[PDB]
RNA sequence: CGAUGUCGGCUCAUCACAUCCUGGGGCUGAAGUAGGUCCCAAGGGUAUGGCUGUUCGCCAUUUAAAGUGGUACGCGAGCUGGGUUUAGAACGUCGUGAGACAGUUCGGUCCCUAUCUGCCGUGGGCGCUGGAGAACUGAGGGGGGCUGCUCCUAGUACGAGAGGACCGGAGUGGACGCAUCACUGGUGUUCGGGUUGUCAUGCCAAUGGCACUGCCCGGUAGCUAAAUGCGGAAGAGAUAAGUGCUGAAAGCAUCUAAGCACGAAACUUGCCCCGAGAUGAGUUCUCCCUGACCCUUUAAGGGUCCUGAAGGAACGUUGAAGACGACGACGUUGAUAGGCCGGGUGUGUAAGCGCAGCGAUGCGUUGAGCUAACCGGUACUAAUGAACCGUGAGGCUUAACCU
RNA sequence: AAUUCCUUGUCGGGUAAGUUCCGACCUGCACGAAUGGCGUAAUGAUGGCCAGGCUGUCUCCACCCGAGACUCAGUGAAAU
RNA sequence: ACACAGGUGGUCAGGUAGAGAAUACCAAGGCGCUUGAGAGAACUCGGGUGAAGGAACUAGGCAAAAUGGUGCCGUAACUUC
RNA sequence: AGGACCGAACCGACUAAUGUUGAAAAAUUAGCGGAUGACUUGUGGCUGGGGGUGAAAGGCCAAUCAAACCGGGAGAUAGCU
């Protein structure tokens, strides 16, 4: 979310704990956590995941403890901070299957595949 | 911090121009005893408006 | 800032404020007229007058609440037996403040706070 | 003032069901993907607010697949079509934040001629 | 176009059937009775003076009472002025006045902002506090340098320092009207307007829109 | 040299333009996209990290861009002391040795209550020509001027293909600024509850003190941001580099000499704030005062008595105003504060009694009891009648008007 | 290397990024065996580095509670 | 130098909780520290609590935050056992 | 048994903040080290200035130390201000 933020991975190919090295989009953007794309290092990885430790690639935040605010004032708060790993050049999901809840805020462009694969929207 | 040159007695008076006390300009007179008191205050013999409010 | 806020700190902590208002309310119930500085009298209205509004209804739980505040059983007994019937028809304003002269030791605006239907 | 709590009263809906915190309520919210609208079910334990008028809300928590998703929904919003009380749970606190934050620990049900 | 004077009576919501929950500020616009019209002959400009509210007639001073009694007797809490580019208004009052805001879609609301007192630099401007823990003898939220040694030898006039914030006029522009309710005498505007509750607000049609 | 603190970082800046981005153009070895180079242009904007004491530099990842310089290599009576730059100690080298190094390593006290200028805020006196209460005109001054991405034009122009428009539109963001608290939250020592240890109210029960608010759990008002609304514009004038029309000097020719039309985020307006102490003190509306005497060194004055006007000031209850002044509401023809009644909110079924249980405890009464700063009502308490300040028709010269 | 100027030498390692660190190589300006050379369990308010927990250190500040600061009464300095 | 937040040898040692001369609340006993009264700005000192992130701060985790007791399991590389 | 371990009194002084015309001519508040010993403290005594004493720092020798303080030479000298 912020820089120096550890996140869980929703998708399978992305592995375990990941850290946000940069908040992409914006000159001095401090905090971005709803549908935003963040540059990611892999701080710890299982070997079954395709990506490995020390590798930089993009991600999109899917779950935030801060939570989205709906238009009527509703706040959906998800426990845990989660990301879906994306390729640096393509920004397309590496993982074949997305796990856990997703929000309807991730309905734009390449995130349609994420909400298609993920069970609960 | 410290002054670089000594201020004049003129500057002292100009600063003390606003340190002038204000008089009362009106002392209220009670009806049942014509002694003067501060307005909205007891008469120092024990009366407010027409009645003996405090015995002391 | 202090916006739409009530209560006067009176340059003391909250424990000292509650202790002074308990002792002060007990003194006002016992003597029925006391001399105190004017801000303290204005804040005293808000601790003495709820006790009399409690004391208009006489019950075991109400006696316990008026004991938990002010912690003095003689003040509880006076509040429920003597006052209460003294103020039952009266709808508020049991305490009345009369501004008096300035204190000699320090120039404090002083006042007399008294129960309204005091005999003398 | 007075002109608010009249303006707010004309917007409030009077069919809100009554439910204490600790209950497990199912709410039906409208999701509009295109021109089509469908009801969506959210069931979970509640940490409620008492009726602040039109500006009222309830938060429910559900552990979907190991992740506790928590939804505040406005009471009198047109999004919330229906609330169903379902299970009634006996709790001792108005806000159940500690009792929701744990995983695998659930609000108990006691029915003492409730 | 001319504007009206209202008292802010708080903020609430209008829940649309979609679910937008438009956040609104309710403004109570009474009948704004015209006190004086100024023209290019007697004065230098075209305006109408406007009174609204009521006053107890004990606090009405005799000069103000004579001003009201000339050109239609009325009791009002204050006088506010609105200039006209093109319109023509009579010296008697307007009976119903909020209806001119029914057709308009954006308004500008001008009010006295809530006073914050003697406000620091960190509160007043968005000045950054120096680091609390690493040393920092008594210079946490203080202003830092205000100047540049001998060569200016002075502090510039537009310097951002501590001072009063609030109790000053501000204008908020391009605010959508949600609903103008004439019999309730209410003007519902999207968003947040200046003032505390109960304060006089002048609302005008949007100059930008 | 009878003392001008040293690099760097933090906070806060301000200027120049030799312009990094955005804006306007010329040439191009400029097909488009993207470039190179030069001219105009300072309105705004112009990164976060690993390393190191570092400015630097290198590196990771951004961005429209991560400008270059001046300001005692800006800024220590603003902060820091990592560095050089004391006194302890060691290593390498030099010297017999004391010690030394334009080498290294560890440690190593950073004072000031602001007189004057300067700024930032807020007031008293007087002036503005009789004195008041309000509304203004705007001479000036300040603020604000950023920009990304997706789509339509349009796969159109252009193009061997690959690719692909730097006109005109619409949406949605990053950064910034202003306001506000309806939502989402944060705080909430002045609300409710749980509970440890002890002391006390005789005792059981119920409470209160103290232990950071004892430790917590929630929390009203208010303030707030991370929450929500909005804005930087459009337009007009005059322009800069540039582009021209007509057109002689110089029969042609030529943007200029006579004329004329374009042209940028620069300038002046337009938007927002202060603003007639704007001594150049302005305007408009309304209110209020039209009595005698004495002396006189008479453009002029002084005094006496009677009279005190509109209004202000004071005093009190106070405020979403406030350091204090100041500003706003109210003063018995009263809702200005506190209290009181009702509601809302918040906490979570009080005390007592009964029942069950060996007991802890449970159940009923009971969503009970307390509840603030909130909302709506109510003169119960305090806002007393005065008293004070302010006066009694306002100078002199000259013009349309009437004696 | 508490020593190496060049130098941030070069290989392996740790981070997205490592002038610091570890194991080293030997091209040791200018290590070296009681001016001790090299290792070493324990110990250290010792030096350097990494990680987990933890958090207002920070992003980026916000509220509240007390003592000052402000106002009033009494006493009443200083450097310059 | 002061009716100065410092220094000053020895003796006695109640209850409850507690290992305790810690610490908390209190006995006996002594005190409120010789200026007060208001308001509730900035800023300073001493605290409490903070959404999300969590060392991105910084010369450096400086400072805060954190862990903490008894009983019982268990527990290494190297070792001078 | 332990120049053993955790830790009050006691001894010391590692970091930070406040103070720096202080409450204090080195203290306060949180943490810190040692705490049966190369420990600590009371009362006397002994060592005297180019001398003492030093688990060594130019440390200490009465708020004074690369040679204390007090009086004398002494009105040293001063090409310097």
Automatic annotation (TrEMBL), chain A:
Top-level taxon of the source organism: Bacteria
InterPro entries: Ribosomal_uL14, Ribosomal_uL14_bac-type, Ribosomal_uL14_CS, Ribosomal_uL14_sf
Cross-referenced Pfam families: Ribosomal_L14
Keywords: Ribonucleoprotein, Ribosomal protein, RNA-binding, rRNA-binding
Biological process terms in GO annotation: translation
GO CC term, one of those recorded: cytosolic large ribosomal subunit
Listed GO MF terms: large ribosomal subunit rRNA binding; structural constituent of ribosome
Cross-referenced PANTHER family: 50S/60S RIBOSOMAL PROTEIN L14/L23 (PTHR11761), LARGE RIBOSOMAL SUBUNIT PROTEIN UL14M (PTHR11761:SF3)
Family from the record: Belongs to the universal ribosomal protein uL14 family.
Assembly and oligomerization: Part of the 50S ribosomal subunit. Forms a cluster with proteins L3 and L19. In the 70S ribosome, L14 and L19 interact and together make contacts with the 16S rRNA in bridges B5 and B8.
Function of the molecule: Binds to 23S rRNA. Forms part of two intersubunit bridges in the 70S ribosome.
Official protein name in the record: Large ribosomal subunit protein uL14
Gene that this sequence comes from: rplN
From TrEMBL, chain B:
Cross-referenced InterPro entries: Ribosomal_bL32, Ribosomal_bL32_bact, Ribosomal_zn-bd
GO cellular component terms, semicolon-separated: large ribosomal subunit
Superkingdom of origin organism: Bacteria
Matches recorded under HAMAP family: Ribosomal_bL32
Record region (Disordered): 1-37
The protein's name in its UniProt record: Large ribosomal subunit protein bL32
One Pfam family recorded for the sequence: Ribosomal_L32p
Keywords of the record: Ribonucleoprotein, Ribosomal protein
Database matches in NCBIfam families: rpmF_bact
SUPFAM superfamilies the UniProt entry points to: Zn-binding ribosomal proteins (SSF57829)
Family statement: Belongs to the bacterial ribosomal protein bL32 family.
GO MF terms, alphabetically ordered: structural constituent of ribosome
Annotated GO biological process: translation
UniProtKB/TrEMBL annotation, chain C:
Annotated residues for binding of Mg(2+): 3
Matches recorded under Gene3D superfamilies: Ribosomal protein L17 (3.90.1030.10)
Keywords in alphabetical order: Metal-binding, Ribonucleoprotein, Ribosomal protein
Gene Ontology biological process terms in this record: translation
GO CC annotation: cytosolic large ribosomal subunit
GO molecular function: structural constituent of ribosome
Keyword Ribosomal protein (UniProt): yes
Annotated family: Belongs to the bacterial ribosomal protein bL17 family.
Subunit record text: Part of the 50S ribosomal subunit. Contacts protein L32.
UniProt name for this protein: Large ribosomal subunit protein bL17
Organism listed in the record: Escherichia coli
Lineage summary: Bacteria, Pseudomonadati, Pseudomonadota, Gammaproteobacteria, Enterobacterales
Gene name of this polypeptide: rplQ
UniProtKB/TrEMBL annotation, chain D:
GO cellular component: cytosolic large ribosomal subunit
UniProt keyword Cell membrane present: no
Keyword Ribonucleoprotein appears in the UniProt entry: yes
InterPro entries, A to Z: Ribosomal_bL19, Ribosomal_bL19_CS, Ribosomal_bL19_sf, Translation_prot_SH3-like_sf
Highest taxon, organism lineage: Bacteria
A molecular-function term among this protein's GO annotations: structural constituent of ribosome
Matches recorded under Gene3D superfamilies: 2.30.30.790
Pfam families: Ribosomal_L19
Protein name: Large ribosomal subunit protein bL19
Organism for this UniProt entry: Escherichia coli KTE182
Gene: rplS
């Amino acid at each position: 979310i912020q820089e120096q933020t550890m996140l869980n991975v929703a998708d399978n190919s992305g592995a375990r704990r990941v850290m946000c090295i940069k908040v992409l989009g914006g000159s001095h953007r401090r905090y971005a956590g709803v549908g935003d794309i963040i540059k990611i290092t892999i701080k710890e990885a299982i070997p079954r995941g395709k990506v490995k430790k020390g590798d930089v690639l993009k991600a999109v935040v899917v779950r935030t403890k801060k939570g989205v605010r709906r238009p009527d004032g509703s706040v959906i708060r998800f426990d845990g901070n989660a990301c879906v790993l994306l390729n640096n050049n393509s920004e397309q999901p590496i993982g074949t299957r997305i796990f856990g809840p997703v929000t309807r805020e991730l309905r734009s462009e390449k995130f349609m595949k994420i909400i298609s694969l993920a069970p609960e929207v | 911090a410290v002054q670089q040159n000594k201020p004049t007695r003129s500057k002292r008076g100009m600063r003390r121009s606003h340190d002038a006390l204000t008089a009362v300009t009106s002392l209220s007179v009670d009806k049942t005893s014509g002694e003067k008191h501060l307005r909205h205050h007891i008469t120092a013999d024990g009366y407010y408006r027409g009645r003996k409010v405090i015995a002391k | 800032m202090r916006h739409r806020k009530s209560g006067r700190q009176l340059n003391r902590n909250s424990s000292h404020r509650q202790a002074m208002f308990r002792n002060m309310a007990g003194s006002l119930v016992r003597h029925e007229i006391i001399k105190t500085t004017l801000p303290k009298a204005k804040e005293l209205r808000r601790v003495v007058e709820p006790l009399i509004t409690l004391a208009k209804t006489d019950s075991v739980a109400n006696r316990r609440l008026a004991f938990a505040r002010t912690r003095d059983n003689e003040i509880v007994a006076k509040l429920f037996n003597e006052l209460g019937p003294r103020f039952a028809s009266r709808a508020g304003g049991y305490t009345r403040i009369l501004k008096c002269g300035f204190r000699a030791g320090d120039n404090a605006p002083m006042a007399y706070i008294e129960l309204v239907d005091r005999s003398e | 003032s007075n002109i608010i709590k009249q303006l707010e009263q004309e917007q409030m809906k009077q069919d809100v069901p009554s439910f204490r915190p600790g209950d497990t309520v199912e709410v039906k919210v409208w999701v509009v993907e295109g021109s089509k609208k469908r009801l969506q079910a959210f069931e979970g334990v509640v940490i409620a607010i008492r009726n602040r008028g039109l500006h009222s809300a309830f938060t429910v928590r559900k552990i979907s697949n190991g992740e506790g998703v928590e939804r505040v929904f406005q009471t009198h919003s047109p999004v919330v079509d229906s609330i169903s009380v379902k299970r009634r749970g006996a709790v001792r606190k108005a806000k159940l934040y500690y009792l929701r934050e744990r995983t695998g620990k659930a609000a108990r049900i006691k029915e003492r001629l409730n | 176009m001319i504007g009206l004077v209202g008292k802010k009576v708080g903020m609430t919501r209008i829940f649309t059937e979609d679910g937008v929950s438009i956040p609104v500020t309710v403004i109570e616009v009474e009948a704004n009775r015209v006190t004086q019209v100024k023209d290019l002959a007697n004065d230098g400009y075209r305006a109408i003076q406007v009174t609204t509210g009521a006053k107890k007639a004990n606090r009405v001073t005799k000069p103000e009472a004579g001003h009201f009694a000339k050109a239609g007797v009325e009791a009002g809490r204050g006088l506010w002025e609105f200039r006209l580019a093109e319109g023509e208004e009579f010296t008697v009052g307007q009976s119903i006045s909020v209806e001119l805001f029914a057709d308009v879609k954006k308004v500008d609301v001008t009010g006295t902002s809530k006073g914050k007192g003697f406000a620091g630099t960190v509160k007043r401007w968005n000045f950054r506090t120096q680091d609390a823990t690493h040393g920092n003898s008594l210079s946490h939220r203080v202003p830092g340098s205000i100047g540049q040694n001998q060569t200016p030898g002075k502090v510039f006039k537009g310097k951002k320092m501590a001072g009063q914030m609030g109790n000053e006029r501000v204008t908020v522009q391009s605010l959508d009207v949600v609903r103008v309710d004439a019999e309730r005498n209410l003007l519902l505007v999207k968003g947040a307007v200046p003032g505390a509750t109960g304060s006089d607000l002048i609302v005008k049609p949007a100059v930008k829109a």
